[PDB]
Amino acid sequence: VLRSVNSREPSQVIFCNRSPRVVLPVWLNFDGEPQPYPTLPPGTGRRIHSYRGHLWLFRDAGTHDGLLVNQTELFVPSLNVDGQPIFANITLPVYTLKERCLQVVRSLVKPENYRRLDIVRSLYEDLEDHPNVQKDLERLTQE
Amino acid sequence: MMYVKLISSDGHEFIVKREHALTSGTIKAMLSGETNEVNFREIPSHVLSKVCMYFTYKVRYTNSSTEIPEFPIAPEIALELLMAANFLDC
Amino acid sequence: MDVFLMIRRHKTTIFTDAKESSTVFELKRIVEGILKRPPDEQRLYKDDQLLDDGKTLGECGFTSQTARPQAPATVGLAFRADDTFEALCIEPFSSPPELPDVM
Ligand SMILES: COCCOc1cc(-c2scnc2C)ccc1CNC(=O)[C@@H]1C[C@@H](O)CN1C(=O)[C@@H](c1cc(C)no1)C(C)C
Numbered sequence: 618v619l620r621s622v623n624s625r626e627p628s629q630v631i632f633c634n635r636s637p638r639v640v641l642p643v644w645l646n647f648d649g650e651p652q653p654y655p656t657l658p659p660g661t662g663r664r665i666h667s668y669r670g671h672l673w674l675f676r677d678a679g680t681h682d683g684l685l686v687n688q689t690e691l692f693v694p695s696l697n698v699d700g701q702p703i704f705a706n707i708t709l710p711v712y713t714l715k716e717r718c719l720q721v722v723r724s725l726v727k728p729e730n731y732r733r734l735d736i737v738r739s740l741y742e743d744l745e746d747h748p749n750v751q752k753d754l755e756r757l758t759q760e
Numbered sequence: 761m762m763y764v765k766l767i768s769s770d771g772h773e774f775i776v777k778r779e780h781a782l783t784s785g786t787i788k789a790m791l792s793g794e795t796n797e798v799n800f801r802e803i804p805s806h807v808l809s810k811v812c813m814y815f816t817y818k819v820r821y822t823n824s825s826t827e828i829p830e831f832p833i834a835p836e837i838a839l840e841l842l843m844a845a846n847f848l849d850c
Numbered sequence: 851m852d853v854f855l856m857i858r859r860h861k862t863t864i865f866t867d868a869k870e871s872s873t874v875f876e877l878k879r880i881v882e883g884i885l886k887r888p889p890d891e892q893r894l895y896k897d898d899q900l901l902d903d904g905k906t907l908g909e910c911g912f913t914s915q916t917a918r919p920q921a922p923a924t925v926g927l928a929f930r931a932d933d934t935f936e937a938l939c940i941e942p943f944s945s946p947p948e949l950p951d952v953m
Contacts, residue, residue: 637829637830688823709829710828714831715845717833718838722953725835725838725953734952735839763884770944771861772863772941773862773863775864804943806943813865814920817920832921836947839950
């Protein structure tokens with residue numbers, strides 16, 4: 618279900634990183650396969666060439682934490698009105714406190730030492746279940 | 761404007777907007793089970809103060825188009841804050 | 851422009867927001883609605899400095915850039931106990947434990 622439409626209609630976009638993370642843009646190809654594109658440092662923007670009907674998602678390039686684009690999960694380039702490029706505003710979501718805590722703990726502890734933390738077994742498994750694109754694509758497919 | 765009191769394990773009393781506290785489903789169940797006071801025997805004030813800052817941050821930046829800043833978490837409180845967040849479902 | 855605050859006295863911390871253009875007296879009316887003490891029985895502070903009722907929060911140093919939702923600015927509160935005001939006292943939060951070796 619989640620794949621780019623082969624419209625062959627150019628759509629010029631500005632990927633605008635309004636987050637403190639290094640952003641990894643991901644294009645869902647014609648077979649639904651996630652294709653990584655060059656990263657964007659925090660606070661930077663790039664004018665990119667895409668097509669109408671194409672599917673994009675944005676992640677933190679280092680940890681694969683999910684990011685929002687125009688307040689939602691997926692970005693679909695649309696029709697350029699009067700030659701104006703479409704802004705793809707990439708922002709941090711309002712993560713849950715739990716997800717934000719899991720991010721901070723993952724950034725301080727090597728994956729080998731998650732088992733040495735004095736926490737309940739369910740939290741060790743939550744730490745090990747690192748954010749991933751395939752898992753989110755399956756979540757978004759079921760929905 | 762309705763407010764609720766969240767009391768830490770060390771006796772600090774945090775008065776937050778009722779709408780903000782209701783971010784936690786666990787808190788909502790403890791309020792709709794004094795009458796608008798919840799005691800947290802396991803959550804110290806260095807953790808409970810940060811949970812209240814999270815509620816403010818969440819209510820302010822949810823569905824907002826003004827660039828969202830990172831929610832800061834000092835490494836020293838990350839483990840207990842993770843446990844509190846897991847219990848509170850927030 | 852909204853400013854995000856922690857009004858603190860002893861072991862009480864009120865989390866609230868206010869306009870940067872709103873005054874110290876208007877903030878005392880907010881405290882009155884919560885702690886049930888009139889503005890004439892309250893003293894508000896920014897650090898050890900007593901704040902004037904007619905001053906806006908912005909004039910007192912509470913700016914949106916320094917009083918954020920995720921990191922609110924602290925306003926000290928002292929109540930009038932019979933004839934005299936008590937000394938400004940804010941009980942500190944608990945100390946976090948030592949960071950584990952794995953962190
Ligand atoms: C042009 O030189 C190589 C760089 O190409 C690019 C780099 C970036 C990024 S993303 C972050 N930083 C940068 C610079 C973004 C885009 C591009 C080039 N632009 C692209 O690669 C676009 C993006 C996506 O819509 C698929 N695509 C295609 O061209 C695909 C295509 C062709 C037709 C017809 N229909 O689909 C092709 C890969 C099969």
